[PDB]
Amino acid sequence: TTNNLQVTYPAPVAADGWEYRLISTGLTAPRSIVFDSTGGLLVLDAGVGVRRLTLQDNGGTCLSVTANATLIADTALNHGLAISADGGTIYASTVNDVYAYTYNEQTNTVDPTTRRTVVTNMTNTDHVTRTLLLSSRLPNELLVSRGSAANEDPQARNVTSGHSQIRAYDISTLPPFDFVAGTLIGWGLRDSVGVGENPTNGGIWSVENSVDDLTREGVDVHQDNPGEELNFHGILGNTANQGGNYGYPDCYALWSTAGFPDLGALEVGDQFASDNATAGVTDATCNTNFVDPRLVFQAHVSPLDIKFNTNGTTAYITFHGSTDRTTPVGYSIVSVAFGLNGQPTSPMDSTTAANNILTSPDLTQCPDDCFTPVGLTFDTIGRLFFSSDSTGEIFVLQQS
Ligand SMILES: *[C@@H]1O[C@H](CO)[C@@H](O[C@@H]2O[C@H](CO)[C@@H](O[C@@H]3O[C@H](CO)[C@@H](O)[C@H](O)[C@@H]3O)[C@H](O)[C@H]2NC(C)=O)[C@H](O)[C@H]1NC(C)=O
Ligand SMILES: *[C@@H]1O[C@H](CO)[C@@H](O[C@@H]2O[C@H](CO)[C@@H](O)[C@H](O)[C@H]2NC(C)=O)[C@H](O)[C@H]1NC(C)=O
Ligand SMILES: *[C@@H]1O[C@H](CO)[C@@H](O)[C@H](O)[C@H]1NC(C)=O
Ligand SMILES: *[C@@H]1O[C@H](CO)[C@@H](O)[C@H](O)[C@H]1NC(C)=O
Ligand SMILES: *[C@@H]1O[C@H](CO)[C@@H](O)[C@H](O)[C@H]1NC(C)=O
Ligand SMILES: [Ca+2]
């Protein structure tokens, strides 16, 4: 490599058979990342806009950033970033709007005047990120995620508010869509920041940042509950397993049974009534009217992205890390094994489905001396790249 970048905190530990390298540093707050057609890495640097890193590639993890330009300067862009399959359009989001920009791959420039607003009316308080995903199987379909306005948001009970949900938009048909004009992929999703497509079948998957301060029969159980969730939303362009309500704010998934008041026949993975559920809602109601997660993960690990490998055998998820637990959790990259039907190989009650790929050597140091993984992407040869927003870093990760 050109440069020898090193981390400034006790370094991530790779599982056996993996290796990594830090390749960019001094970014402000890097969120979503994607490759352009010319081998450049586009970085949604929150509060700055979209930056393009030029990389030199000597094979394996031997990559070096040789240059960087700001393609789009806009301080409102806070997370979401996508690029068309032909490479000629960039989509990026603010709290309120999803913009499309023409991207000139001959120059590697974007003319600001080319900006059009494709989706709008998304603004709300608290969860302000708007994850963008373009389908591979249906390349005209743009998915957009949008969280709650508060930890327990009552407007998430009203589907027309557009809070706590994922929408799909046919961009080929485009005066922006209104947020709630899109096909409904899911609602009752508090903050499903990570959304991905499994190539095995085009199955749509999201990962949930579930509720804080969880009380159960008035007892505080927030330390180990509720679960973070892997949720399944069917395939794009069909309604099976899609558009349902995944619980929030009425129902939450169970991670840890021990010391859980009013367990009943509840198992790991099953949802239960929130103490603050609307008048009438019970556990049976959670069981019959709301869509359960397909897997759960350790409470508060805070997943932010999910990406599958070319073959669909494995998904990789970023765990950005807990902020409210006495002993912190997350601060890792994990993988989840998937089968031929495009479902996880683990049962929905498993507590061991997340396999560690890259971890913080000592959780007691986090957040302050730990990476906080956010964005993931694959290059053309299957190498995995990821962002760490709080340390201003980009890493490459691969099997050795
Ligand atoms: C259901 O709704 C209730 C009511 O909003 C939520 O209760 C909140 O629980 C937290 C405990 O984590 C309370 O915070 C604490 O308040 C006391 C004062 O009594 C203070 O000494 C503590 O340091 C802490 O700030 C919070 O006040 C309470 N909120 C209220 C009464 O407004 C509960 O978390 C919700 N249940 C869920 C999300 O499962
Ligand atoms: C993007 O490019 C700029 C231009 O080279 C880099 O800015 C230099 O950064 C180093 C940081 O150690 C300074 O010593 C130089 O003075 C900077 N030069 C200028 C002209 O500002 C910047 O580091 C690059 N950023 C990333 C994230 O790669
Ligand atoms: C539902 O959502 C829309 C939000 O725009 C609003 O017009 C309506 O009054 C809301 N409340 C309901 C149906 O309870
Ligand atoms: C946003 O919603 C408001 C209603 O509050 C409406 O005036 C406006 O037409 C919407 N914008 C678009 C582009 O749909
Ligand atoms: C798919 O991807 C991974 C990485 O190449 C590999 O370990 C796995 O064996 C592959 N599966 C199939 C069915 O080819
Ligand atoms: Ca749920």
Residue numbers in the entry: 27 to 200, 205 to 430
Authors' own words:
Here we report the biochemical characterization of the AA12 enzyme encoded by the genome of the ascomycete Trichoderma reesei (TrAA12). The three-dimensional structure of TrAA12 reveals important similarities with bacterial soluble glucose dehydrogenases (sGDH). TrAA12 preferentially oxidizes l-fucose, and weak activity was measured against d-arabinose (11.6% relative activity), d-galactose (5.7%), l-arabinose (2.8%), and d-lyxose (2.2%). Based on these results, the AA12 family of enzymes is likely to have a catalytic mechanism close to that of bacterial sGDH.
The polypeptide chain observable in the crystal structure of TrAA12 covers amino acids Gln24 to Asn435. This domain folds as a 6-blade β-propeller. The three structures superimposed very well, and no major differences in the main chains were observed. All the structures solved present a constitutive calcium. This calcium stabilizes a long loop which joins sheets C and D of the fourth blade. The calcium ion presents a typical octahedral coordination. Three amino acids are directly involved in the coordination: Glu259 and Gln301 with their side chains and Tyr276 by the main chain. Three water molecules complete the coordination, stabilized mainly by the side chains of Glu238 and Asn26. Of the seven predicted N-glycosylation sites, five are visible in the density maps on Asn94, Asn147, Asn184, Asn306, and Asn341. The two longer N-glycans, on Asn94 and Asn306, come close to the symmetric molecule and participate in crystal packing.
